[PDB]
Amino acid sequence: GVFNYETETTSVIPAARLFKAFILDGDNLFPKVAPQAISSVENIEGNGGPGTIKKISFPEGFPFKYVKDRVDEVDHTNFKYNYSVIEGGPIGDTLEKISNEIKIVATPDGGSILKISNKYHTKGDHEVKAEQVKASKEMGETLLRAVESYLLAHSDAYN
């Protein structure tokens, strides 16, 4: 079945720039700005749209070795990005997939709001634990704050 988790967070970076950097260039940025969170991102297949497969490796000592993520949808107009965790890490005989939807919305102060949904698809029926949702939220927040710091410091990046 499906367990749905939703959260929101804010950024001081305008929505379009944040989307271009944090979403569209995460493969480059995450290992650069947050090497103690993500060791590397490998493009396995695909050119960035629906179906593109990436292997995300975690640093030594992390709970999981890697995950493979699949791009589901990329909406450049509405700053929506959907992707799924489809192999590795928590995926296996109790958890088939984690489907994620991110939307970035502008705020009038010049920042943005990020709306995040994480949908865990289980076999039957293997309760999803608060600790696992917390870890995903914490990773996302770490990556966001690292990218935000980089964007604040490199004004000519991603305009």
Domain positions in the chain are 1-159
Give all strands of the β-sheet with 40-45 in edge-to-edge order.
2-11, 112-122, 95-106, 80-87, 66-75, 53-57, 40-45
| Cβ contacts of 73-78, under 8 Å, gap ≥ 24 | 74/23, 74/24, 74/48, 74/49, 74/50, 76/19, 78/103
User: Which approach determined this entry?
Assistant: X-ray
The token pair at 95 is 């958890």
Residues shown for the chain = 159
Cis peptide before 72 (omega within 30 of 0): no
Backbone phi, then psi, for 149, in 5-degree steps?
A: -60, -40
Q: Is 65 among the annotated ligand-binding positions?
A: no
Looking at residue 52, its amino acid is T
In CATH terms, the fold of domain 1-159 is Alpha-D-Glucose-1,6-Bisphosphate; Chain A, domain 4 (3.30.530)
Cα–Cα distance list, 126 to 2, 66, 131 (Å): 10, 21, 14
User: Residue 150 annotated as binding?
Assistant: no
Is 82 annotated as a binding-site member? Answer: no
Distance CA 12, CA 104 (A): 12
